[PDB]
């Protein structure tokens, strides 16, 4: 699949 | 007013080559301390960063913190004008919604002088924290660009397995399937040839080589590439600018 | 009859790189004077004058004056079957309506020997007055060719400065805008990389370098290319052609 | 159970590189006597045929002949990930309907490992019978690559005259018509020589000719081979290990 | 605003 | 025209 960097950081 | 004269032209060009093909416009911020940009792709799975320290260029005169907006691809444009051997000096006003580039030649027969119209651009910054990385790897930037691309005409996706001895970069395709296995540099080497790996855990990450394409564009910038990985969490591709800083991409893996 | 014979092939073979890709289709004068061929473009915005002596050539011997119609496509296709190295011998007949090419090598152990159909062609010839210019500007061919390539970039149409001191190449895109500033050179070691500035008054007129793009294709014939200007008066680009002649292209301005 | 070990791993690549843009799929006939591989054209018009000898690698080991069915697109493809100076080794069990690819790189701290699916083929193997020639003319490959190239820009077809003097190439076009003339030359890559037991004139569709040139890396010089209304051959020498040859059929009208 | 060079010459 | 090798070996 592929999900986006949005989730992995944030702020 | 903004100032920063960079001697080494080239260093510029290269970068925006970088970017252009990822991400097309971008904010670049400003400071005493240096240039520093970071902006998600279209679709919002790899993230770029870019850092050139003050220090890095010959004049550097930054009075408050500026916001340029800057359709990159524009810019390319604009640095495509650009004599690798040319003197590359910036300049923005604060009101300035337009940023100048001017291009003095290898013994000054000639001076190209641009003048670029910016954008308001909404940047939620991301928080990347600092972390250790399971899996570090210092490698021929050369090699890895070479590699990404073979790949990407046998599958869709790449993954790297990682451990003491060395790294493996596979994909499968309807043709068939490929893995490329290389060792730490033994008879440690001449270091631009050479591969190194720092190991906390074995690591095996998949990846869209459609990025990673896309990534290898800053070869031009360093000879090598270092490759920091951890599982489900993002792989981050650092190629290091010439004592003025680096250019990290940061990529999904996927499931 | 008519027959001469080049020695330097080349020479010819880089003429019809010049013009095929401006005119399709074009009549060739030949005199007991020389190849005389003057022909505008598909869309009668640009003309471009032919002048080769007859002094140029090794043999030369024409009779009659004839008007030889050519799809110089067709005659580009046949010269680029003709080594670098190569003599060139040219023939024709009056009443004959077929132009016979012969390519000698420097190893005189191959010899091509083709022969190209004609056409009938309408030809309004242009009087051209010889003219006194406000500016006429003598630079590196090269270094034209990229300046014309690289604004092509940032805009449809080129603004030409002149002064006594230099000449400014600028542009206006969406994205931005661009200026290309030369100065006259002193203590001139040579002309090859040399530019020199003839100014009667000083001029600033406006090109669409979708043309002058077309032009420089001839940048092959000449280190140096001559652009001579008068207000509301059309751009005169000049090739010197190895001491047989000249290739002039000529561009209206813009209001 | 086999596998060979190829030193220059390019010989391999500009083979490929020459077959794939004439022939999509061919089978690869491996024996303890080396790789013998034979396929017309879409069209049933060309023919090319390759040998590799045993010999001609460093190791080379073959249990079962093998008949290998391959997709030459998918195989370039292969051939492509691997460098210039890299030593190609292959691979392939005998039940084995997938051909292994090893790529080692003059690092030795590299090595690629692929791994190819095969296809089942039917493919007639014609009998070519060894033949005297009319005129068989050595030419360099480049010279030869660079006269089908331009003549393609005339015409359709071209002429082929030889006798002892030398060899004329001749097209004609709706444009025009160009008759190129070689002679047989002083001192032996550099040089034209012609044995002629009768002269010869036939006509091949450069169409196919330029297909053929796509071999001209893999020599300096290329030898032609003609006699009246059989196929002319197109023989590319292999350094040492064999040579990949083409054959054509000529034309002639009402 | 381009013109043609007919116009600028002739003849 | 143009024949086809088929014709030109065989077997």
């Known amino acids: 699949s592929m999900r986006k960097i949005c989730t992995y950081f944030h702020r | ?255």
Chains 1, 5, 6 share one sequence.
């Open chain 2, 1 to 255: 007013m903004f100032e920063a004269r960079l001697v080494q032209g080239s260093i510029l060009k290269k970068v925006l080559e970088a970017l252009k093909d990822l991400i097309n416009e971008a904010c670049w911020d400003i400071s005493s301390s240096g240039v520093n940009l970071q902006s998600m792709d279209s679709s919002h799975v790899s993230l770029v960063q870019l850092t050139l320290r003050s220090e890095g260029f010959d004049t550097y005169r930054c009075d408050r913190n500026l916001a340029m907006g800057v359709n990159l691809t524009s810019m390319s444009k604009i640095l495509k004008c650009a004599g690798n051997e040319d003197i590359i000096t910036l300049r923005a006003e604060d009101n300035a919604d337009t940023l100048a580039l001017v291009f003095e030649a290898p013994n000054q027969e000639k001076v190209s002088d641009y003048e670029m119209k910016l954008m308001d651009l909404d940047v939620e910054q991301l928080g990347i924290p600092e972390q250790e990385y399971s899996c570090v790897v210092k490698m021929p930037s050369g090699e890895f660009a070479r590699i990404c691309r073979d790949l990407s005409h046998i599958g869709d996706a790449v993954v790297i397995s990682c451990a003491k001895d060395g790294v493996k970069f596979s994909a499968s395709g309807e043709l068939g399937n490929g893995n490329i296995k290389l060792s730490q540099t033994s008879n440690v080497d001449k270091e631009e040839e050479a591969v190194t790996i720092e190991m906390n855990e074995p690591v095996q990450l998949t990846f869209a080589l459609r990025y990673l394409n896309f990534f290898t564009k800053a070869t031009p910038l360093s000879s090598t590439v270092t490759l920091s990985m951890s599982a489900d969490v993002p792989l981050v591709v650092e190629y290091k600018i010439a004592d003025m800083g680096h250019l990290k991409y940061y990529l999904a893996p996927k499931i």
